[PDB]
Structures are given as C-alpha cells and as structure tokens.
Amino acid sequence: MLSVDDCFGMGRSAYNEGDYYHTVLWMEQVLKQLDAGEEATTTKSQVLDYLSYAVFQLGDLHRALELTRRLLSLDPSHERAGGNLRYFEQLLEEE
C-alpha cells in the first residue's frame, strides 16, 4: 500500500487537477488509514476540507454538509469552513 501521507498527496494532486472523483477515492482511503491508527503528519481536519468540497462537486449534498460539520468540530476557527457550513445549512434548510 501507500502511506497515509502518500495517499493524501495523491488526493491533493487529483484535487488540483479538478478531478473531484479521484480526490474522494484518495481522501476516503486516508480516513480509513487514520482510523486504523496509522502514523501520519496529515490531520483528519485537513482531509475533511478536501473531501467535503469534492463530494459537493459530485452532487452529494447532505454528505457535504455532514463532512463540513465534522471539519468545523475539529477546527472551529476555520473561517472558510464556517462559511461553507452557513452555505450548506441555508441550501438544505438545516439551520
């Protein structure tokens, strides 16, 4: 396999190409390995930032909201994430 930080780098590479589907595949794998206790410099909040935006681009609306809530729970001063949460809660009438 690839390491947690390698998979994260793969997902960031896909994201910077505008390839949101492959961003999802890689970041989901990161989350799996982080939850398996694997050592990594990458934090969950950083993964959720890419993943929440990518799943929104793919049309997965309530999951984007769920992941944005989880991101803010782990990084409360993340101003961009707070703006995203306001957007998704207004979009989905979940305020």
């Binding site: 960031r12 994201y15 910077n16 930032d49 890419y50 929440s52 935006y53 990518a54 929104f56 984007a64 944005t68 961009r80 703006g83 995203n84 957007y87 998704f88």
Partner: peptide, 9 residues
C-alpha cells in the same frame, strides 16, 4: 457566486 470554497491548493 453563492457557494462553498475549497482549499486554494
């Protein structure tokens, strides 16, 4: 437009 913003890079 009105929408979320992802990581800049």
């Amino acid at each position: 437009p009105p929408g979320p913003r992802g990581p800049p890079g």
